[PDB]
Structures are given as structure tokens and as C-alpha cells.
């Protein structure tokens, strides 16, 4: 059979697609219309959007229809699918309503791990102690302590698992400090935002769609039920990021340090680099005050 | 602090670890899973929630205790909250089936699209060209002199299917929708009006059930094809497995284009000698 | 330029490979011949022989040496390979020279986890005292219970004792096993730590490591053959022979230890299947350990299952607040 | 039992627990590493050497407890064994080099081709070399009619009164790996690769004679340090072309060098290829429907006309 709208590759495509798809049209139409959460998926919504033939191409599909049997399968779908109303729209409508949740549930996880960082550290008094005998602090390391052949941070943690047995466990009380280096507030931020456009526009296309033209179409029906509880979880995870964004400034009074000159990410990073460097510290005193205790031993 | 009355240590270490990562009111998560709140639900929730809910008898113990609530440490409120809600578990397990329903239709029907394009495309010329260096080139070498252009997108798909897997999968679907099914039929009274429930499901069942049956009519044709082909090629349809079939057929093809490129070759370095002589 | 004797295809296949790969044709030629190995990459091998025209369209791009320069460079390459004896045998000695010591590094592991498993299990002092304490359990302790009285030291049988209720009925004799070893032989308890090897075991395949095994034979036979027949080095820059030689020798013995750590991994099964009574020809080394496995596994599930029961009911006791 | 005599409790315990899985005879090991055997030696197998090899000071402590082999530990003996080895750590880096350096010169090698083969492409395209960044603000303005752009315009142009640019986006094969590639990271690796290879030929040089047929390190590594120099002399030869053509481009075309990094120049180049095909694949395509559009209505006018 001829194309007389579609072009090649257009055509060449929608032909694969259906094909390894095998189902009827108007199927399609329907489970478009009414929603049916038992066909679609994510990935199915994508490729209707991303194999939809262009507008203009629809309408002029749908112009001349009267040669349905005369049409390849791929120009038939195409007459088909002209019969939807705000078909794109709708689409993305769909396509939000089966991805919000989860890009929701993506993004949470990133504000709790720094949030409870943030807790984490505030309320840990080992940590305190730690401070006591003590951002700029990956730089102990880097220096000497009272004798020699042992760099201060040794020192500190020997004089810490001497008679500190206690902040000996800071460590265990940053759980989500590591979670919290490997966020990326900029990237947070965009995606609240994108998030932000993503509920507006949805929002519009629905306070924008049509009326009943067909009494299968329950598009508005769910639709603006959903968008009213998208928002809802939208501004709850927003209060979590403020939240969060408000906690990362108290410890920039508390442990006094500019948060404007330090993201959350690049604060924790370092902090998490030292809870690794005393850790690793502590392992080397125990390796040192073993062979030591040889080297005395050799004397007998 | 705060003693645990119910949960058992390690129940209580981790839905604490839990519920301090998920971070939401106790009572909104129960209604999320009253009116089963879709924009709020996923399947990793489900299944965690699945996974720290709980044993039901530790869950009734604690909803007798509603009492003391601001004494119980966060483990047991949760346990409180959620010993509220009837049928916690095939609910939550219903649940669970609506969002991974369509993905395993997705699934399942490639394998059987597969498979049948591939009979499909069988019996609609590759026949003749078998049954009449090695015989592949020989018969190939005819099939260029004499009946030539006499040289299936599917087969190759076909051929990594398992039609054992295929059946159990259809039959694990069928299970699943026939237990979501009774426990919907055997569910309570929807007292709190915020509990949409057995009507959700009950129409998503319906749902499923169109589809799992349009799924097992797509299935048994396929193997109904399968059959057309014992017949054509004379084989035991249970002997040989789709699987195998397709596999053979498949590496079949390949060795006779292969010995076909081959002849080619020997072909065209024949012209690049005929010229070089004169 | 124009094509005197390869296909259309193979001439521009190897146009973007030789292209992309920027080296005079005499020194790739010479890159072979030495096997120099500061060169050579796996990668590199097995692409030449990919691409490398066919034995027969070499023979024929040899009468046209005078017109060298008058041949396409695809068909320059082809003149130059041309000229090294035994192209492709020799090619392939020398990937299989290459791949070698990896090859050798990944059936190494299979046999020495199946083995390591197999001495743990016989050195296990606390697995050893299960077995008993499990003989004590279902020969004397419960009467009542299925096979009492018939139990040995059959693992798969271990791996169903989570299947059968012990003599008062709260109770499976996987959990009284597991009560028993908590309550009287906290020690018993240790016996996963001693059987490093076994989840590895598990997720071996005796077949293939078979399989593995025949393959590097047949393969080392094979280049042993090729260098047996090799023809006396004309150029002085071929290495083959020497090189070839000499690793031939090396790889043979390494074989041969894999050979004999393989037979000694056999033996040991062997013995374990008269201990734990079991056909070694019917049950797969793999099957095995899967089920000493999966036993170590629900067994301290079970050891986790009874705490928690021991604890909720305790919260019962204390009910009587 | 078996008392440590020098090393540290965690050293012991992951050495018995590395020496559990790779099961290989303690003079093995050290023959092995002494013939220096391609045909057993791997990356892999002397990266584990190298990490789980006690330090230099407690394989001394245990090289003098050589009458108590027997009684030591596991861990200890291999200790002994391994102690006795001059020169192990030179040793098996040299070793570790020798196993990885065809590989990371064959890493190495693919950029420097693209962008090299890029720069050639590129000057000989004169298909290219005429089409004159600002064919970006085409794409932005639309034409007379929002029905258009003014890049689609000047691609139909193109298209109508000068066919031969149809030809131009394939003519430019390596430019998109070009663009990817990174200028500095090359030079690092390069330098990276100078001082590895310089290290292995200072260690080969103040090495030790040997004092027993089996060792044949020196033998093999100064060798081989020859024919790494050879080669990696031959990467920077590449190298520096490289760097010379892309020289070239910045008069072929007028452009500071220094300024433009390689990757900046043919990502921007890249973009270019990009933006023109779209248009001209974009203006083939609405061209396409028109066609469809005219056939449209001819063939629903002879309709009406047959009808009649």
C-alpha cells in the first residue's frame, strides 16, 4: 500500500512499533482515553509520544479516511489517533500521573540523607568532644604533634582511645554523613524545579481540556483529582527542602562557618574525609603499638 | 529510652531505620494506603512496606495498647497506626498487583510477539532449501545458477525465548489475579469513607482480567502456530521446542548467508582475475 | 587507487582498521614476527585475524610486489602480510599467548573454592557437632517426628528439617536444632565462619570447569602442533619459534597443575560422597554445596526466628502489667 | 595457636585470608615472580601481591627468623619466603608495567587518531571550508513567515544552487570523537607514561645482579624498557603531529590555539555538522509533505472528476 501522509521514515517507524505492539487501534484509543492503568506503563506513554505522527500529520490523515482498508497500517493507526482530542497533552498528562510518585520518591531520599546529616551532627556530643581536644580539619594530618614520627591527628585519636573511650564512636553517630557528601544541592534544587513546571503545565492542559465529546473519555475526571494530590506532595517535599536548606544554616552558626561559600555536599564531603582519615589513624596506632610492643619483646 | 511492649528488637531496630528515611505522619502514611493514593504510592514502597509491616498478631497486641501511644517509642506508633487498618497485608499485597500489573503484561507479551512473528513469517519460501566445500555451499551455489533469489526479523528473538518460563509466567499472572480477586471478594466493610478500596480494586480486577485473558489468547495461538509448523516441516511439537526449533532455524540461516558470502567472495575475486589476464 | 584482488568489502574493512590505526605496514609485519609484547594487546590480535584478508587472496596479491606502490594501501597491507609464513596459525599462537594467564586465572578459583569447601567441611569442629546435636535431634529427642530414628548425615535431608514439625508442635526441627545449639552448644553456633568456601562452591559448575579444562588442552595440543610444524625463520626479526617454544613448555606446565588440582578436587568430592553418603556421579559438586549453603543459611534464620519468638514472648509474660 | 612474631594482627589476618583463596605454594609464588612467568604472572595477580605485601621493615624482622620457619604462622612464612626476594617492591612494579603497558598505550592511542584524523578531515573539506557561531542566530530568527527559519532557508540554498555540501557532513568522520576527547587528560597520560617508564629504567639499572639462574628480571626488564622507550617515543612523535595540525587549523581557518582547546574546537564544529543536516533534514522532510499535499489533492480532485 501507498503513504498519502506520512513520510518514510515516519511511516517506516509506526510500522515496527504496532507491529511488535500487536494491538488493535482502537484499543489503543480507548486505554488512551479511559486511562486504563492495567495496559499502561511508562515506557509504553514514551513511545506513543516519541512515535506520535506530528499534528498537522493527523489532520490531515483524518481528512480523507473514507479509504480506511486503503491505508498501510501505519498511515490506519494514524486516521485513529486523529480522533483524540488534545492527544499530546493528554499524553503527558498520563505520562506524569505514572512518573511522579517515583521522580518524587527519587528525590526525597537526597533531602532526608542531608537533613539527617545535619541532625546527625548537631546532636552528636562525641563529635563535640572530638572538637574540644582538637571544616579545616582534614589539615591535622598534615602537621606534627609533640614528639615526632606521628602526625597530631594520631596523637589526638591515641589520646582519644586512651581516656576518651567515648568520642571513639562519633564516627557511629554520622550515619548519614557519607549519603550527604554525595548529594548535589544544585541538582536538587533543578529538580524541584523541573518538578515545579512539571505540575503547573499538567495543571493548565487540564483546566484547558475540552468537554465529553465521547462519554469513554475520563481524562478530567482522574486527572484533576491526581494533580490535586501531585500538589499537595510537591509542597510537602518543598517544606523538606527548606527544612534542610534551614538546618545546613544553624550549623553554619553553631560550628560557625559561611554556608554561602561552602555547599552541603562539598561541607560533608570533607567532614566524611576525616571521619575516614581518624578512623584510618586509630588502625595505624594499633598497628604501631603492636609492633612496639615486638620491638621490646626482641629485648628479652 | 522508651521501652518496646510488642515489637521485637530487631523488628523495632528496623522499622525505626525505616520510618526515619521515609519521614512522613504515621497517620498520613496509613491514609495513603487507605484510599491507595497513587501519587504517593510505588512499588519499592509497597514492597518495603510489605517488608517492616509487622507480624499481625504484633500489630493487634499494639492496637490494644492505643492507650499509652505518646509513651511508645516510634517503632510501636507506627504499629499503632497501622494496626488500625483492616486487612493490612492482602491489601497492601492488592495493592502491590495494581502497580505491577501492566509492567508485567509489558513483560510477557514480547516473548509470545516474538515467537509467533516468527512462525508467521516461516510459512509465509525458506521451505524449499534443505531437504534437497560443504552441501550449505553446493545447494547455495544452485540457488544462484538455477533457481536463484530463492534466499525472518523474528527468528533470532524466538530463538532466546523459553517457552517453559513463558507458560509459568501465565500462569504465576493467573494465581495473582485470582488471589487479588478472592481477597477482594472476602474483604471487610468500608467503614472510614477515606478507604477506597474494594471499589479500586474491584474494577482494576476486571481490568487485569480482560487483559490476562486477551494475554492467554495471544499465548495459546502462538503455540496453535507452533502446531501449523509441525505439520508443513512434519515435526513432534513437544519433541522439539520452540526454543530449539527457532534456534536451529536460526543457526541455519545464518551458515547458508554465511556459505552465500563465502561463494560471493570467491565470486568477485574470480572478475579480479579475468581482467587482470587481458 | 584500484582494487587488482580483494572483494569490495574486505577493502574497505581494512582501509578504516588500518586507517584508525596509524603504523607503517613493515612495522605491524614486524610487530607480529617479534611477538613484541610491548605492542601486541589482546584486543589488537584478534582484530588483525578479523580482518585479515583470506590465506587464498594473500597468495594472489604476491605477484604484485612490482606494483607496490601502484596497489591500494588495503592491498599494500595484504602484499606485506603476504609475506610472513604461517599468517593465521601464527596469529593465533599468539593470542592464545596472550589470553594464557588469564584464562588460567579464571578456572584457578573454581577448583580452589570447590576444594577449600570440601576441607573446610572435613576440618569444621562446630559443623561437625551439628551434625551430631542434628543425629541427637531426630534419632532420640523427637519420637514423634517423621523420620526419627533414621537420620544421618545426608545435607539435603538437613535442608528439609525446616519442613517438619518437632515433638511439641511450636516448633520445626530446623528451630528445636537451632534452640538446642543457642541454648547448650552456643560454640555450634560458629560454624558458619568456618565454612568460608561454601558459598563460592555453590556457584560453581562442574561442567564447564570440566569443559575449561579439555578447551586449554585442546588448545595448548593445537599450538603445540603449529610450532612442531613451523617453517626454519628465514627473516631474523621471527620470534615465533623461539618464543613459542619455550611458552608452550610453561603453559603445559601450568596445565598440568590445573589438571592435577582438578583430579585432587575430584578426589576429595569422592570422599564426601561416601561421608555424606551421596553418588558423586549424580549429585554436581555445585548441587552440594547449594544445599550446605542453603542449610547454613536457614539455620540462622532460624537462630534469628527463635530470639524473636523468645522475645515477643516475653512481652506476653510481661503482659501482666 | 602459631604466635605472630612480627606483623600486626590485621596484616596476619587478611594475608591468611588472601593466602586462603589464591592457594598457590609460598616458592611458587616467588618463582614465579623471580622467572617473572608470562605464562602464569597477571595484572590482577601482582596488583594483590603488591597490596597485600607487609612493608619492607617487618619482611626484614621476619627475614632474620629464617630457623624458625616451621613454627611460624602462615602469614609469617610467606613473610620469610617472600622477605627473602631482593628488590620485591621494585620488582613487581616493574613486573605490574610491563603487564599493563601495551594496554594503556593502546588506550592512549585512539585520541590522539581522532583528533588527528579530524584535523585532516577537516582541511580537506573545502565543501566546508566555504560555508560562511552565527549559524546559530539563523536557527533563533524566523524567516518571513513564522512558518520557517533562516537556517532552514540558506540549507535549502545550499541544497538548490550548490548540491555539493550534501557530501560535507560525511566527510567528517572523526570529528564527533574529537570533540569528546581531552587535550589535557593526553598530556597527563603521555607524562604519566614518561615517568613510569623512566622509574622501571632507573629501578633496572641500580638493580642487582643475580645470584641464581632462575632470576630473570634484568634480563626481561632491560629488554623491555627498550622497546616500551621505542614506543612511547613514537606516541609522542603522534602526539606532537597532532598538536601541529590543530597548529595548522588555527591560520586555516584564524583562531588562537591556545585560547580554543581541542575539545572546544570540534565540539563547536560538531554542533555545526548538527545544525545544518537538521535543516536540511528537517527542510527534505516538510518539502516531502508538500509533495504528499499536492498528490493529496490532485488524486481527491480526479476523485470528484470520476465521480461526476
Given at each position: 500500500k501507498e503513504l498519502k501522509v506520512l513520510d518514510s521514515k515516519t511511516a517506516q517507524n509506526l510500522s515496527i512499533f504496532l507491529g511488535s505492539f500487536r494491538m488493535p487501534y482502537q484499543e489503543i484509543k480507548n486505554v488512551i482515553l479511559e486511562v486504563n492503568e492495567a495496559v499502561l506503563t511508562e515506557s509504553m506513554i514514551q513511545n506513543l509520544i516519541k512515535q506520535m505522527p506530528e499534528p498537522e500529520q493527523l489532520k490531515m490523515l483524518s481528512e480523507?479516511?473514507?479509504?480506511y482498508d486503503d491505508l498501510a497500517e501505519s498511515e490506519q493507526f494514524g486516521v485513529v489517533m486523529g480522533t483524540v482530542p488534545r492527544l499530546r497533552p493528554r499524553l503527558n498528562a498520563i505520562l506524569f500521573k505514572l512518573q511522579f510518585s517515583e521522580q518524587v520518591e527519587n528525590i526525597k531520599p537526597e533531602i532526608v540523607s542531608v537533613t539527617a546529616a545535619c541532625e546527625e551532627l548537631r546532636k552528636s556530643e562525641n563529635f563535640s568532644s572530638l572538637l574540644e581536644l582538637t571544616s579545616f580539619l582534614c589539615k591535622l594530618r598534615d602537621t606534627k604533634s609533640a614528639d615526632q614520627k606521628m602526625t597530631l591527628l594520631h596523637f589526638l585519636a591515641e589520646l582519644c582511645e586512651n581516656d576518651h573511650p567515648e568520642v571513639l564512636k562519633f564516627p557511629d553517630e554520622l550515619a548519614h554523613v557519607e549519603k550527604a557528601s554525595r548529594v548535589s544541592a544544585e541538582n536538587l534544587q533543578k529538580s524541584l524545579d523541573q518538578m515545579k513546571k512539571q505540575i503547573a503545565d499538567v495543571e493548565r492542559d487540564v483546566q484547558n481540556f475540552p468537554a465529553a465529546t465521547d462519554e469513554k473519555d475520563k481524562f478530567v475526571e482522574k486527572m484533576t483529582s491526581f494533580v490535586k494530590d501531585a500538589q499537595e506532595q510537591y509542597n510537602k517535599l518543598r517544606m523538606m527542602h527548606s527544612n534542610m536548606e534551614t538546618l545546613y544554616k544553624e550549623l553554619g552558626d553553631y560550628f560557625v562557618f559561611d554556608p554561602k561559600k561552602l555547599s552541603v555536599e562539598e561541607f560533608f564531603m570533607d567532614l566524611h574525609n576525616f571521619r575516614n582519615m581518624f578512623l584510618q589513624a586509630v588502625k595505624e596506632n594499633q598497628k604501631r603499638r603492636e609492633t612496639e610492643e615486638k620491638m621490646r619483646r626482641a629485648k628479652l
Open positions: 480523507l479516511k473514507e479509504e
